[PDB]
Amino acid sequence: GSSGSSGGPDLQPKRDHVLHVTFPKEWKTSDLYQLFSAFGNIQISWIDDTSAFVSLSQPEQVQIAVNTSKYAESYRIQTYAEYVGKKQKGKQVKSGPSSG
């Protein structure tokens, strides 16, 4: 990093070790630390009442969390790149996402 290098002059993604997580509005930072305790130390960055980003120390841990979330029924997990690739959310259709 700021020590003297960024990996190269290329413009590839920088979030391959980061997840996006979706949950009921009653979930807390403590439930998130409990969910991701399987991967050691982490970092958490909110974006709504019902979703946040979560950083992990390896992309292998990201792949394991994305595989294991298929069995969850009180939360769900995807990569940062999946969240970006689904940004066209289309949440409601009564008039449009501009109105709900």
Ligand X SMILES: CN1CN([C@@H]2O[C@H](COP(=O)(O)OP(=O)(O)OP(=O)(O)OC[C@H]3O[C@@H](n4cnc5c(=O)[nH]c(N)nc54)[C@H](O)[C@@H]3O)[C@@H](O)[C@H]2O)c2nc(N)[nH]c(=O)c21
- Altogether, the residues listed in the chain come to a count of 100
- Closest-approach residue to ligand X (CB): 46
Element (H, E) at 46: strand 43-46
DSSP state for residue 71 in the 8-state scheme: G
28 binds ligand X (CB under 6 A): yes
Interface residue with ligand X among 1, 6, 12, 25 (CB under 6 A) is: 25
Q: How far is CA 36 from the centre of its chain?
A: 12
Question: Do 57 and 17 meet the contact criterion of CB atoms below 8 Å apart?
Answer: yes
70 binds ligand X (CB under 6 A): no
Instruction: Candidates 11-19, 22-30, 56-64, 73-81: pick the segment binding ligand X (CB under 6 A).
Output: 22-30
Total interface residues for ligand X by CB under 6 A: 7
